């Protein structure tokens with residue numbers, strides 16, 4: 001298995017099965033014949049197998065050669081910013097003293113008061129399904145949680161072609177019905193840049209936190225989005241490619257595994 005070198009780490013992205021919005025357009029990693037366990041049981045598995053959950057700060061420090069990672073290091077991440085992240089996950093993180101990354105879709109968290117969040121063309125959810133800014137700031141101030149961008153409004157599908165086939169918003173040059181054309185490279189870069197910039201500003205404004213990482217929705221990213229993320233200062237990126245993060249893996253291309261859980 002993985003070399004124990006104070007540098008190589010695994011990342012585990014946790015998804016609550018009751019937030020069942022998975023996407024057609026997205027090309028997610030295979031989940032078939034993988035057992036869904038409870039979150040508490042997951043935290044107990046982590047412990048008993050000898051994993052040592054680490055923070056993003058610890059990753060950065062190991063790369064800079066200041067402090068090596070502990071053995072069997074793992075990064076836990078919780079994206080999308082649903083309310084259960086605060087009421088269920090947060091007190092377990094505290095009880096086990098495990099750090100985590102929480103990645104915020106800021107157009108969801110920051111939606112106008114009294115309005116519903118549209119997730120898909122046929123699905124809207126109440127504003128209060130999501131953690132409040134005050135709740136996120138509290139997690140950030142606990143010392144246990146690193147806040148990250150899950151984009152502002154890239155956590156959805158956009159039109160890839162005239163008929164109606166969808167692709168992830170961040171990856172594709174989107175087709176514009178009003179223009180009668182696709183986005184050009186300049187337009188595309190501008191849209192993704194403004195999105196990332198907005199999510200970082202909103203997070204800093206409301207929590208005081210300067211983020212330094214992006215968790216790409218649906219693992220969708222490319223050369224252009226990585227370059228643009230770098231321009232806005234987000235030099236840490238998390239993908240859906242699985243595998244060990246060995247020293248030759250750039251922190252812009254962090255690998256992670258996806259696992260589903262149930263809460264009680």
Ligand code: NI
Nearest residue numbers: 079080217218
């Ligand atoms: Ni997500």
Ligand code: NI
Nearest residue numbers: 201204205206
């Ligand atoms: Ni501001």
Ligand code: NI
Nearest residue numbers: 110133205206
């Ligand atoms: Ni506000």
